Write a protein that binds this ligand. Structure first.
Ligand SMILES: [Zn+2]
Lengths: 97, 62, 53, 88, 177, 74, 217, 81, 52, 158, 75, 72, 63, 74, 74, 74, 74
């Protein structure tokens, strides 16, 4: 291939006529195409939040959780509020795992 | 959070450098190019009537 | 209505701005209706007067 | 007849040999022409505004580091630590 | 602002120089009116001159003490020294009061000018009084006029005028005494 | 407990912000009634602007409710 | 010497032509009393050289502020105008440009008790012109940080690709907030440059020289 | 018809961009103060100190921290408590 | 044929400009075909009359 | 060099070259025609407005000395005479340029509309001229009143 | 230089975002912004935007006007 | 395309609207007066444009029931 | 106690809307079969704010 | 923990600036409905004016949310 | 810890002034829509008046935020 | 310090006076758009009256800011 | 001393009457623009009545400044 031209033609195909609005059916359930891209947007955001949460899961959240627990942890450094306690709990949890 | 910067004068000088470069690039590289193609069209569209009357009067081929 | 009639009524301000307009839409629309009605009235009276003469 | 020396450097036809180079504006060649013909005679208000802002924010940075110096000095002349012991 | 100083006394002095001298000056509709608008007086107290007109009638040209007009925003009443007004009238009932008696004139729309000197000029096309209305054709008229709506915008306008006129007429013929 | 005590009075003060949202929705729907009365030929379109402005005015309602949800539970 | 060749009718040339003519139409010239001919042409040229280049300055500020505002909507990037010094320095420098123009009009001489409060209302717009841009660029990004911190905790605490609609109803809200951020990023550049035209064109009024002699009739 | 003349010239930067990049870097590196997390010391203190005892834990945060506040290096243990 | 070169030069130059302007005409061909127009327009840009 | 490249000279260069050649009285018909062609057609028509009247006066003098009547050049150069371009001069130099401009305008018999600025530069301040110089201004004022088809009037502010 | 500098900038900004104490929030804000880039490249009419920017300039809003072909004939 | 009252938006003049309402008040009037109100309801004239000076096509109106409710 | 002052603005909004219902019914009485439906749709969407405030005053007291 | 309680009670009272933004959004979209019933043939322009005004009053909404979060988390 | 608590609750009571600014901005931006539905021909002029008014009613919002930053960080 | 703490709450409750001048300037600048849509030819007089009214209404804003600055720093 | 602290926090919440003063002046100065747009001939009597209402409505602003200066200094 040419490193300027092949992926250019491939992206032209993917952008213009490799459309998954009809090649995956999808007219039979959605009304318009302005409703599909409005849902493809929120689907892209939900896929992004799930992929970036799952790619490094055993972590203590920086963001304020609502007092909930991910899975069977419930008292671990994943669910702690003060960060130094979760820091030393991770330091003891890491040598065993 | 990040409310005051570490140096206010550095950020104000970055604003001055960026806006002064945008002023220079406008005034030097873009506005001549804007005005050449705008004023060729503008001089033709304003001159057209008097130009064609002057050229009608100047050529003897009628 | 506003082409010439409002321009002939303004004497440093207006003589029409004394009137509180009580129409739905703007004063240009009420004058546009009012001069059509004035033309119809003038025309009806004109060709009654001319028929009597 | 009108013989192509009356059309010299006045009227030319579309080129057949090769497309020429674009004629530069006098501001695109030398910065001195721009700086002495438009930048100083027309934009010196903007340059004065930018210099006023840079000097004023230098004044405010001087006020802020003198306040930091005052707080640091009155923590050193009290036997107390002037910060949060780092953090780690 | 008034760049054309028009008027009859200017037309009669400019018309002498552009016309043949045999023709006398044409008359103007200002010379056949008497009550003006800006001129002083013409109210004297609790009565005020109400000129209720029609193209084919002059229903009243006396003085009244209050005039209820069916304006497009709603029914208002004109008392003696009212604010100057150019009120567009909805289909409704004008009542000219002159004491205890009230003539209930149902108009079909028009205008009503209250002038600065207190002269009320109601200017409608048709003004039927309420006794000469039948209540039989108005109900099938509203039923049929609430039925036929094609894609024409012209018939939407005519049908809206129809339903608002007949509905105001039923409102003012079922609410009488 | 002074912190969990003050979170309650904080959320109570925070949810006063729905008063202006309710008054604004009242003014907007009252204008919908007035604009439908002034011409019936557009009342199908005017309720669309009513729901559009209702969603964009309840953006403020949910902002105040997420501040309530954030004060009670950060 | 060797400058680049430009296509006529390029899209950046058309866009910048429309932008420059928009900001130049904000402070239009004054139609004189006498009809414009060869007699009035040096007076018109002279009035055009005693007017400040608010067209050029306003499109300078519009282009730099809309590029710095739209940097905050590209991934891996922060807006430079979300810094306090950057945005507030652009505001203070516009106010100082208007003040330096108005001072050079009279004499470089600095102007009851009603007028010093008019001065502290005039010297406030230095603060206001910058910090409207700064707080508008900061507040949307701050709400975006907070509300996606609240939008991450529910797929954290519950399952990934499980209990979808409570995360869908907050991801729609985040999408709407970034759309509002795009709208605010364009409108604040527009508001800054409209206000720069207003503040500088307050002092953009000089004396039309005109003809001091005439041959009438 | 001139469409293949503009395809000859490829991508090309704005015509003074080196001045903008030089100005922004000459503002970000010609600051006149230590580099925001470091402090200037004497030469004897630099030559006396190990490299791990010369770094701070704050200025090396963990690239993908499992606990918010995790740092790479731990710095000098010589606390003056 | 006495003054045909000037009239046909005017005709050919404007025909080429009008055929290609605003579509694909480069600025170098404009400044080649019409050098003094570009000179006067650059005078207006140089002397602060770009909005004249 | 000027006559072979007259299309490339601007008015700010040609006015200096003509002021030099008006010092050292050295001319041709080809040089006068090419400089007039350049200033009229090869340069911008407001380049006389950007000139300052102390050099347009020497250009008019250089053309009236050699008797070279070029009404296109005279109409172009007469744009550069106004209240603006004369008010930027000192009163001695303004007297010099008004006298030389009025002399070179009556030499060619060309009385443009912008001669009234040159005349009113003298008529609002007659305390600088002799009786002979005010006679030279009044002669061109009468000639320009008859040529422009009107009567002269000083304009007062208000 | 442009593509290497853009990739170098994206890598350096992603190194700095991921160690920022609110790091997963930054990595998800990149997703929230790239989603709108993807949405703008899908619902913006680009021919309408082209011919609407073309109408902003008076040079391209209409054709040229001089030299009306009867004045410049040589018969 | 016009912006005003609802008759003006639908292309209708004010005269035609007000005469439609007048004819509609007449069409539900009491029959001792309704018939003699059809005297002033009838429209009987004719018209013809003059584009050159002597020529023109014609147009006639013999409406006894009122002004046209439908469009022009 | 200070949580339920949202009901002040909800009551003022309902009052403005039900006042305009009377005003628009007097404007034309023929569309009053639609205007009460529009008034009840607006009343429901203002009761949404009222139920939000009561959900907060019940989630403070009982949650 | 008087400071962590005070930030909650401060950012509760900070949120009641959203009431006026909700009321202003209600009166603005109400005037959009009224003006779109006034003349329907520019109703797609009045929507543009409504979205301009909506962005410039959600400006004030985000100002109050900024000081809410600046009290709460900073 | 009473000063660094009173600063937070004072800023939360300080930024209430963005309720009247948001409501006044909504009234002005609804009056833009109404006045440009009256005559749409001077709608370029009325948008300029709306922006000249927006800049002067939000200067009070920046006064209120100036007081907020003066009683949070001074 | 209770005296230094209560001046923060004093400045915060004192600058709630800016909400009313924001609502008033919004009403006045909306009436400028409404009146300039009536007669656009006499709009410069309306803008002059609007700026005179703005200069006499933010004097209340500057008086409330005087109270704030006299509480904080006096 | 909680006396001077209470004086500061009371001179704080005493200034909120200037909000209603500013809203009243904004409504009155907006009606000045509306009434001077109705008929510009009487626009000189109308600004006289506007300054009359200004002087009679600043009486309440000064009755609030009088009490806010005798809370602090009496
Ligand atoms: Zn971020």
């Amino acid at each position: 291939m040419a490193v300027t031209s092949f992926l250019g033609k491939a992206f032209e195909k993917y952008f213009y006529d490799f459309s998954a609005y009809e090649q995956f059916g999808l007219n039979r359930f959605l009304s318009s195409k302005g409703q599909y891209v409005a849902l493809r947007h929120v689907g892209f955001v939900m896929v992004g939040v799930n992929v970036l949460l799952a790619a490094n899961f055993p972590f203590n959240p920086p963001f304020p959780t609502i007092g909930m627990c991910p899975a069977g942890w419930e008292g671990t450094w994943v669910c702690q509020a003060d960060k130094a306690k979760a820091l030393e709990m991770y330091k003891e949890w890491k040598k065993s795992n | 959070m990040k409310l005051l910067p570490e140096s206010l004068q550095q950020e104000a000088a970055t604003a001055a450098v960026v806006a002064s470069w945008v002023l220079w690039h406008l005034d030097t590289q873009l506005l001549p190019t804007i005005m050449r193609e705008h004023k060729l069209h503008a001089c033709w569209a304003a001159a057209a009537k008097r130009y064609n009357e002057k050229l009608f009067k100047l050529n003897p081929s009628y | 209505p506003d082409l010439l009639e409002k321009q002939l009524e303004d004497v440093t301000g207006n003589s029409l701005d004394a009137y509180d307009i009580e129409a739905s839409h703007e004063r240009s629309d009420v004058l546009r209706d009012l001069t059509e009605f004035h033309l119809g009235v003038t025309l009806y009276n004109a060709m009654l007067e001319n028929n009597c003469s | 007849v009108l013989g192509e020396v009356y059309l010299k450097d006045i009227l030319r036809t579309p080129p057949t040999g090769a497309i020429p180079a674009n004629v530069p504006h006098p501001f695109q060649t030398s910065f001195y022409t721009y700086a002495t013909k438009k930048l100083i005679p027309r934009h010196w208000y903007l340059l004065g505004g930018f210099t006023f802002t840079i000097t004023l924010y230098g004044i405010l940075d001087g006020l802020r580091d003198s306040g930091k110096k005052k707080a640091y000095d009155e923590a050193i002349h009290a036997g107390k630590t002037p910060y949060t012991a780092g953090g780690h | 602002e008034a760049a054309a100083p028009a008027g009859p006394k200017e037309f009669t002095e400019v018309w002498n120089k552009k016309a043949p001298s045999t023709l006398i000056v044409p008359e103007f509709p200002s010379n056949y009116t008497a009550v003006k608008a800006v001129g002083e007086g013409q109210v004297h107290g609790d009565a005020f001159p109400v000129n209720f007109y029609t193209p084919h009638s002059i229903l009243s040209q006396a003085q009244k003490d209050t005039v209820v007009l069916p304006g497009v925003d709603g029914y208002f009443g004109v008392k003696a020294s009212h604010v100057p007004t150019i009120a567009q009238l909805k289909p409704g009932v004008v009542e000219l009061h002159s004491g205890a008696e009230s003539e209930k004139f149902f108009v079909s729309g028009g205008f009503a000018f209250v002038h600065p000197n207190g002269v009320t000029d109601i200017c409608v096309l048709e003004a039927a009084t309420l006794d000469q209305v039948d209540p039989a054709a108005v109900k099938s008229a509203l039923a049929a006029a609430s039925a036929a709506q094609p894609t024409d915008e012209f018939e939407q306008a005519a049908n809206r005028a129809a339903i608002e006129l007949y509905s105001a007429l039923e409102s003012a013929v079922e609410a009488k005494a | 407990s002074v912190l969990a005590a003050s979170k309650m009075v904080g959320a109570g003060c925070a949810t006063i912000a729905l008063a202006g949202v309710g008054a604004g929705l009242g003014v907007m729907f009252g204008s919908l009634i007035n604009g439908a009365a002034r011409n019936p030929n557009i009342a199908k379109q005017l309720v669309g602007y009513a729901l559009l402005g209702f969603a964009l005015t309840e953006s403020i309602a949910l902002f105040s409710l997420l501040v309530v949800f954030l004060i009670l539970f950060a | 010497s060797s400058v680049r060749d430009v296509k006529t009718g390029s899209l950046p040339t058309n866009f910048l032509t429309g932008v420059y003519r928009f900001w130049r139409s904000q402070n239009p010239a004054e139609k004189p009393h006498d009809p414009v001919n060869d007699r009035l042409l040096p007076a018109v040229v002279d009035a055009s050289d005693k007017r400040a280049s608010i067209g050029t300055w306003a499109t300078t500020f519009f282009c730099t502020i809309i590029s710095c505002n739209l940097l905050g909507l590209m991934p891996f990037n922060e807006a430079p105008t979300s810094g306090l010094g950057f945005a507030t320095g652009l505001g203070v420098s516009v106010w100082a440009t208007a003040t330096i123009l108005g001072l050079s009009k009279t004499g470089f001489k600095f102007p009851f008790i009603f007028v010093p409060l008019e001065t502290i209302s005039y010297t406030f717009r230095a603060v206001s012109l910058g910090v409207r841009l700064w707080v508008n660029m900061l507040a949307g990004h701050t709400l975006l940080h907070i509300l996606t911190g609240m939008a991450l905790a529910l797929p954290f605490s519950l399952g990934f690709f499980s209990m979808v609609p409570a995360t869908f109803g907050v991801c729609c809200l985040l999408s709407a907030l970034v759309g509002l951020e795009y709208l605010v990023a364009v409108l604040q550049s527009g508001v800054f440059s409209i206000l720069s035209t207003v503040y500088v064109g307050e002092f953009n009024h000089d004396k039309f020289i005109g003809p001091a002699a005439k041959i009438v009739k | 018809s001139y469409s293949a003349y503009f395809a000859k010239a490829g991508f090309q930067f704005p015509a003074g961009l080196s001045a903008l990049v030089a100005g922004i870097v000459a503002l970000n590196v010609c600051t006149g103060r230590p580099t925001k997390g470091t402090k200037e010391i004497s030469n004897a203190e630099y030559n006396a100190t190990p490299i791990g005892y010369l770094q701070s834990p704050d200025q090396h945060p963990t690239a993908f921290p499992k606990v918010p506040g995790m740092k790479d290096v731990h710095g000098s243990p010589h606390h003056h408590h | 044929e006495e003054e045909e070169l000037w009239l046909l030069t005017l005709t050919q130059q404007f025909k080429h400009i009008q055929k290609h302007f605003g579509i694909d005409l480069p600025h170098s061909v404009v400044a080649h075909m019409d050098p003094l127009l570009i000179k006067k327009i650059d005078w207006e840009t140089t002397n602060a009359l770009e909005d004249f | 060099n000027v006559s072979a490249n007259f299309t490339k000279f601007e008015t700010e260069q040609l006015l200096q070259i003509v002021a030099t050649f008006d010092a050292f009285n050295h001319s041709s018909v080809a040089f006068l025609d090419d400089v007039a062609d350049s200033i009229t057609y090869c340069n911008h028509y407001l380049a006389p407005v950007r000139a300052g009247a102390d050099e347009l006066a020497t250009l008019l003098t250089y053309y009236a000395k050699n008797g070279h009547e070029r009404a296109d050049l005279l109409a172009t150069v007469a744009r550069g005479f106004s209240e603006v371009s004369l008010g930027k001069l000192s009163a001695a130099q303004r007297k010099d340029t008004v006298l030389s401009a009025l002399k070179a305008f009556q030499t060619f018999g060309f009385y443009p509309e912008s001669i009234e600025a040159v005349i009113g530069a003298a008529l609002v301040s007659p305390a600088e001229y002799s009786a002979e110089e005010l006679k030279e201004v009044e002669a061109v004022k009468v000639a320009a009143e008859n040529a422009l088809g009107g009567e002269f009037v000083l304009i007062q502010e208000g | 230089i442009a593509l290497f500098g853009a990739l170098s900038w994206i890598l350096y900004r992603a190194d700095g975002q991921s160690k920022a104490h609110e790091w997963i929030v930054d990595l998800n804000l990149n997703v929230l912004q790239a989603a709108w880039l993807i949405s703008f490249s899908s619902l913006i009419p680009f021919r309408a935007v082209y011919f609407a920017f073309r109408g902003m300039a008076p040079a391209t809003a209409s054709t040229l006007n001089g030299l009306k072909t009867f004045s410049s004939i040589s018969l | 395309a016009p912006s005003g009252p609802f008759y003006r938006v639908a292309g209708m003049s004010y005269l035609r609207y007000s005469n439609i309402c007048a004819d509609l008040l007449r069409n539900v009037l009491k029959e001792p007066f309704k018939a003699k109100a059809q005297a002033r309801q009838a429209i009987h004239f004719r018209q013809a444009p003059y584009v050159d000076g002597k020529a023109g096509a014609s147009k006639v109106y013999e409406l006894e029931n009122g002004i046209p409710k439908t469009a022009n």
